């Protein structure tokens, strides 16, 4: 199925989890396609893509080229489609290009209908652009990424989550009383909370500096095993 991963807030671990989950699903014998819908184009760097490599689906569309030629094969069962590098001019003027990318909405359904991939993972930003809402509409399921802090606790009450989304906890620390309090309150009040979480883990901080998914970088790391649990949970619950 098509799985969207969107952070309730910036910098909660969405991109690292998306790459790690794609690697976990590929390791489980599934054909995976992972696409970067965030204009910062950071997902590619978790798969040893050269920083100077500017190609991507949104870059090819802004240049009139074929976005289907922007894909990259990581393993025999894991392909990725980067966003592409935007210039500083395009960065500071998103009015021009955020409406010229609706082709990917129709094109993803082609990949959805071909059956070549058992999983299509989408790294989604939390902006409210029309292309973000369209890609989220293509998703069959969603994961809202949070950390256990007061910021995310507020957001869970004042902003909207994707319909039917499940809440995934990341960066769970040891020895934080305020975290323990917020967590217990969530266990008793947050209905959509997943039955597994991801701890703070030096492997999760190091894998991006090694430009690899955490499962490839350190398969015996605790966060790698927790994300592998999430992968199996997706097989059991998100297959439809």
């Amino acid at each position: 199925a098509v799985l969207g991963l969107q952070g309730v807030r910036g910098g909660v671990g969405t991109t690292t989890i998306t790459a790690a989950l794609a690697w976990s699903l590929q390791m489980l014998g599934e054909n995976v396609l992972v696409v970067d819908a965030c204009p910062d184009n950071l997902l590619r760097l978790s798969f040893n893509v050269d920083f100077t490599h500017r190609q991507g689906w949104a870059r090819a569309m802004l240049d009139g080229q074929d976005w289907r030629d922007a894909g990259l094969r990581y393993t025999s069962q894991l392909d990725l489609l980067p966003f592409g590098q935007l210039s500083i001019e395009e960065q500071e003027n998103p009015q021009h290009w955020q409406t010229r990318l609706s082709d990917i909405c129709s094109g993803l359904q082609q990949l959805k209908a071909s059956g070549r991939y058992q999983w299509i993972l989408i790294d989604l930003p939390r902006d409210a652009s029309q292309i973000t809402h369209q890609l989220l509409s293509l998703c069959d399921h969603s994961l809202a990424i949070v950390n256990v802090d007061a910021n995310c606790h507020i957001r869970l009450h004042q902003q909207a989550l994707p319909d039917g989304a499940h809440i995934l906890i990341n960066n769970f620390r040891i020895g934080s009383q305020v975290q323990d309090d917020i967590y217990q309150l969530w266990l008793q009040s947050q209905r959509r909370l997943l039955p597994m979480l991801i701890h703070r883990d030096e492997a999760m901080a190091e894998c991006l500096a090694a430009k690899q998914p955490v499962g490839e970088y350190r398969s015996d790391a605790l966060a790698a095993e927790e994300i592998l649990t999430l992968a199996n949970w997706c097989l059991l619950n998100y297959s439809g």
Binding site: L28, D66, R68, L72
Partner: protein
């Protein structure tokens, strides 16, 4: 010479943990069954688990994470077989809940248990009829053993070079 994991299953089966190849699993449990210094019917519990249709045994095996030394598992014929050393039968669900990260009802659709020595031995007889071609291997072992055509070494570790390919 003799394999280390086979040697342990011969002489010290209670020191094994984790995945064992089907035949090594059967030999380790049988050597526990015939150890005279172990209690009569208190060696442990043998459990056969059938995965739900939405998961394969190789995938469900990645969730089987025992910690007690002497707890071993194997896969073959779309069955995940566990042996929980010295686990009382009434405590089975406790031990199982410690081993899997998700509820075992959500992973497996059916379960069979043997705790008497004669019943465990009789099931070992049936398991040994399984052809070696039907014996499973863990996913990290078989997946990482496939040929990597986009590999490149940096002097210490292997890395993958992402290759351009047209999506069609």
């Amino acid at each position: 010479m003799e394999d280390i994991t086979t040697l342990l299953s011969m002489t010290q089966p209670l020191k094994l943990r984790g995945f064992q190849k089907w035949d090594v699993f059967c030999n380790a449990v049988n050597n526990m069954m015939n150890n005279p210094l172990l209690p009569a019917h208190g060696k442990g519990v043998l459990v056969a688990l059938r995965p739900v249709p939405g998961i394969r045994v190789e995938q469900a095996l990645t969730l089987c994470r025992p910690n007690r030394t002497g707890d071993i598992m194997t896969i073959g014929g779309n069955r995940l077989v566990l042996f929980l050393s010295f686990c009382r039968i009434n405590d089975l669900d406790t031990a199982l809940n410690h081993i899997f990260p998700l509820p075992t009802g959500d992973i497996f659709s059916n379960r069979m248990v043997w705790f008497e020595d004669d019943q465990i031995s009789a099931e070992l007889v049936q398991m040994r009829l399984l052809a070696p071609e039907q014996w499973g291997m863990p996913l990290p072992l078989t997946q990482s053993s496939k040929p990597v055509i986009n590999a490149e070494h940096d002097g210490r570790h292997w890395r993958r070079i992402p290759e351009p390919m047209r999506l069609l």
